[PDB]
Amino acid sequence: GPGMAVKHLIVLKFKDEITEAQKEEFIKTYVNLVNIIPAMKDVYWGKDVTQKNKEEGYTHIVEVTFESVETIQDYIIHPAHVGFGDVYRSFWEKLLIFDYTPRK
Amino acid sequence: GPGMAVKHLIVLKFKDEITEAQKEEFIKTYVNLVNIIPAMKDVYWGKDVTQKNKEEGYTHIVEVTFESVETIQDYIIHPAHVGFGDVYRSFWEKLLIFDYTPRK
């Protein structure tokens, strides 16, 4: 369709001490935010398989579509997001966030 | 669904002196690889608008769809991919490369 939505992309490396089970629980709890935060519509994620970034070893990629930058910002400040981010902040070693409208 | 795909995600920062005209031509030549490299099925890209990692400087996000990790390898070793790097490596400052299958 003709819509102009905005994708929120998260690129993450967990601390080495975090176990696979802990990463899974972190992602599951994150996905549950869709049911809580109005702006947050859907979550797709995946684990990188090629490990091509050397000293910048991000492993997980999360994609969330939103209607605009302003509603991304609503998600950022929503108390369920603030709470998730604060209590799991020690899980990650590196985090990059991008917001863009995909085009051809 | 019935189809299998792997997303090849590139995060890119151009050198600071590169012009907008140069970026546009660089991207047009990259997306034209779909007409050259069989494995490369589609490209969507966008420019970050929120600058949440401004200090790292990545600005462009490029999403390329492939059938499998094997066809991704065919893309990497294709002469036109090697040749794109021959001609344009001097335009980028840094990159991150990921290969993953998005899921819920």
Ligand SMILES: CCCCCCCc1cc(O)cc(O)c1C(=O)O
């Ligand atoms: C399954 C991956 C979970 C990602 C948590 C990141 C939370 C966060 C922290 C922050 O300092 C800035 C942010 O923009 C965000 C975010 O966008 O969600």
Ligand SMILES: CCCCCCCc1cc(O)cc(O)c1C(=O)O
């Ligand atoms: C408009 C996007 C331009 C992307 C060029 C990156 C080329 C490249 C360089 C490299 O050193 C390693 C790689 O894996 C790749 C790649 O995946 O294409």
